[model samples]
Target: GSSGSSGRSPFKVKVLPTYDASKVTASGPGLSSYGVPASLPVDFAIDARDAGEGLLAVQITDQEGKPKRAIVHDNKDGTYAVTYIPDKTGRYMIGVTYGGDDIPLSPYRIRATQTGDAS
Candidate 1:
């Protein structure tokens, strides 16, 4: 697992005028810190312009190309922070589910880290 201070990043998600890539300042997670899992509660922090209705569905996938967890969160105050605890770790994709289709938002560049032992 990975552990460290929670600092802001230079990233944000743009949702208005069609869903596209927004400046995402995301903070990485501590791998073995038991901070957030992948399957349980799909975690994410997003900033929506609140320009439309409907909830944003964040999909979490596993190594075998399977939809392990889906976190549907509504944009509050033009921003939202989420934490999902997944059982296993591999390749995960986070995006918005709108217009009955999944739009690619941000491709997570999570590096290799241990699976157990916090800190």
Candidate 2:
């Protein structure tokens, strides 16, 4: 499934720019800027309605410019959960593209640091 020749994704995805683990709750609507703790589950979610029924790709790269593996969880109700675990500590760039086009704010940024270092 896909946006097809329509040429427009249903909607744009939203993610937290900075996660405050102190509260341990989801918040924010900007690009990632905080350093995510290494070895922890770094996760982001997208609305299913805007996801459309097409090809979706989530790419992650570590600070060294090496591609990192990502896991996508399809909620099946128009939501997708993208998850990745950082093996090293550094900045990580997250790219999200749908139907071969960049999402509203594609290539979100995040950092991986030692546990309890994210603030």
Candidate 3:
């Protein structure tokens, strides 16, 4: 008997954005297994030039389940900017979504290390 809460929003809302996840595609360094600095912040961006709009979302998780912070900036023109820092040397999972659905290449595996080679 420990299940009651669900959504955070109290009021029901209707979304009008119709960004189709099927036709959307994104390209960024985060999409590949690039060895970024573990102690430094990793830089990358999600270009939604082919997508319709900014109904994009990104999720970051590491192998150690370490909490990390990601900054997403919306250019207000179907383009999204993403930057996240690594907690330590490990594999990371980066997931992207559009319109509440997972987009193509949704999960990107990134390995962070001090060598910056990931090998």
Candidate 4:
């Protein structure tokens, strides 16, 4: 008897941002728990395995629940990044999506404070 199967798909992906030299982790599937500063560039890095190649979407919303601009960078190798600059200091939400679906962490809550201040 000969049967070949790898069981579940090896597809794995991580959508997170980096701040202050630390990688942000997600709160749940397609969710993250990271806070950023308004003074710094809101940078994000993504790692995906066995998911072929795709681009991730990064959306930032202000505390008043308004959409903001986010610039995304593709690393050309299963890795992607994004940058966003906040105009003011306050709470915000970061939403990440990939392949028409939320990637590991969506609608991440973030506190955008002044530089060098922890929230």
> In terms of TM-score, which candidate is strongest?
3
lDDT of 4: 0.59
Question: Candidate 1 local accuracy as lDDT?
Answer: 0.48
Q: Per-residue CA lDDT of candidate 4, range 2-57, in tens? A: 98886675695576422211122323222234555556665656665544443356
Higher-lDDT candidate of 2 and 4: 2
TM-score of each: 0.47, 0.63, 0.69, 0.61
Q: Which stretches of candidate 1 lie over 4 Å from their true place?
A: 1-42, 71-75, 99-104, 107-112, 116-119
Q: What is the C-alpha RMSD of each candidate to the true structure, in Å?
A: 14.3, 11.2, 5.1, 12.4
- Stronger candidate by lDDT (1 vs 3): 3
User: Could you tell me the lDDT of residue 38 within candidate 1?
Assistant: 38
Off by over 4 Å in 2: 1-32, 48-51, 115-119
The candidates, ranked best first by lDDT, are 3, 2, 4, 1
After TM-score superposition, the amount by which residue 68's alpha carbon in candidate 4 deviates from its true location, in angstroms, is 1.1
lDDT string for model 1 (1-119, tens) is: 89888888699766554543333233436222344453344455555453243344555555565765444445566665565666666555445454444444444434223366455
lDDT of 2 by residue, 46-105 (tens): 654334455678787878789877887778875567777777667777677765556656
TM-score sort, best first: 3, 2, 4, 1
Off by over 4 Å in 4: 1-34, 115-119
Alpha-carbon deviation at 46 in model 1, angstroms? 1.0
What is the lDDT of every predicted structure here? 0.48, 0.61, 0.69, 0.59
RMSD of 1: 14.3
Best by lDDT: 3
